[PDB]
Amino acid sequence: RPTFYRQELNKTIWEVPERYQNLSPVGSGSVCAAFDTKTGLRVAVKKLSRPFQSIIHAKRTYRELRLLKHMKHENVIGLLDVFTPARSLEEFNDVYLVTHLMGADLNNIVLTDDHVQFLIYQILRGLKYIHSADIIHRDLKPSNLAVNEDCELKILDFGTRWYRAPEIMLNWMHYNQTVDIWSVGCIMAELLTGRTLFPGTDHIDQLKLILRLVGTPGAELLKKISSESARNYIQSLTQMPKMNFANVFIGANPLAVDLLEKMLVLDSDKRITAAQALAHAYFAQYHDPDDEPVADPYDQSFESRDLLIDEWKSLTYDEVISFVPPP
Ligand SMILES: Fc1ccc(-c2n[nH]cc2-c2ccncc2)cc1
Numbered sequence: 001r002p003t004f005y006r007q008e009l010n011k012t013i014w015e016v017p018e019r020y021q022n023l024s025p026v027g028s029g030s031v032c033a034a035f036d037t038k039t040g041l042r043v044a045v046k047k048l049s050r051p052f053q054s055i056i057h058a059k060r061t062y063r064e065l066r067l068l069k070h071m072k073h074e075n076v077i078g079l080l081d082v083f084t085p086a087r088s089l090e091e092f093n094d095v096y097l098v099t100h101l102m103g104a105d106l107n108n109i110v111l112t113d114d115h116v117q118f119l120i121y122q123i124l125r126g127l128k129y130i131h132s133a134d135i136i137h138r139d140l141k142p143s144n145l146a147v148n149e150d151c152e153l154k155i156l157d158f159g160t161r162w163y164r165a166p167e168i169m170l171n172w173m174h175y176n177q178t179v180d181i182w183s184v185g186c187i188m189a190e191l192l193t194g195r196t197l198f199p200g201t202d203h204i205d206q207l208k209l210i211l212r213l214v215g216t217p218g219a220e221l222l223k224k225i226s227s228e229s230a231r232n233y234i235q236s237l238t239q240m241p242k243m244n245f246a247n248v249f250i251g252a253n254p255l256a257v258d259l260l261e262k263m264l265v266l267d268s269d270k271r272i273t274a275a276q277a278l279a280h281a282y283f284a285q286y287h288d289p290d291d292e293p294v295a296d297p298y299d300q301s302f303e304s305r306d307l308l309i310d311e312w313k314s315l316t317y318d319e320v321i322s323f324v325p326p327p
Pocket residue numbers: 026027028031043044045046077078079097098099100101102103146156
């Protein structure tokens with residue numbers, strides 16, 4: 001077992017192997033930029049807040065570790081290392097996650113059309129992989145998109161309101177992966193105009209703003225809504241038509257406009273998928289079918305289990321010990 005050293009940073013206690021030096025806060029568990037003396041690389045170390053404060057925390061802790069250990073793709077945060085100072089399950093109460101250090105995030109940056117292309121391309125490439133594993137991000141937003149100096153991008157926190165799919169603004173329990181495509185659409189639009197596409201003040205205001213652009217629900221989509229209250233609410237609002245994106249985003253690359261219309265489609269069943277988007281002409285310059293990999297199967301069966309805190313903890317502990325660094 002490696003040698004750990006203790007230190008305090010912003011009222012938070014950090015106990016990490018000596019291979020990690022020069023820890024310095026970068027954001028919020030908590031994250032510290034650091035230097036890995038074994039690899040010689042700059043990394044980001046995240047310390048989970050209270051990994052086992054409750055069954056929910058315990059399971060959440062397990063879920064994140066499982067997800068990170070599975071993600072092995074250039075455009076997705078991956079695990080360089082995971083560790084705990086604990087020498088045994090008995091005293092196991094802290095979890096640290098390590099990944100390559102990424103300079104900033106999209107929320108920080110803001111772009112020209114060429115930059116948007118490369119950035120959105122990467123998001124979609126990462127999303128294809130994630131979605132092929134039957135995983136849905138559910139909370140894609142600028143702050144969850146890490147980018148380094150090279151404009152290389154990685155998706156973070158698979159886990160505000162502005163990038164949430166409309167079906168989610170409503171309470172639809174059966175939304176699918178396409179909710180992530182909607183978020184991309186909002187993000188892309190933001191990168192092109194420099195303004196939040198739908199800055200809703202609340203669930204009602206948010207949905208209101210969305211329908212103003214994409215128009216109110218047609219008959220085919222209306223047929224798919226089981227909730228009576230959802231229908232009363234929706235069908236009572238002032239009917240509005242889908243707007244001409246060419247006019248709304250006028251001046252922008254016509255190809256970008258085409259893609260946006262395909263992403264920001266109200267009916268989730270009609271939204272372009274990540275795989276299809278990568279083939280869209282907007283990404284002609286970057287698209288390569290032989291270099292847009294899918295992920296191995298991801299076992300999500302644990303999600304339906306109701307276990308004790310100690311069982312989730314022990315499950316997590318086992319995942320820490322079984323971890324094998326990347327090549
Ligand atoms: F293992 C991990 C997993 C996630 C993080 C992280 N969470 N929020 C932001 C980051 C982050 C910050 C800087 N560079 C890469 C990732 C850090 C280490």
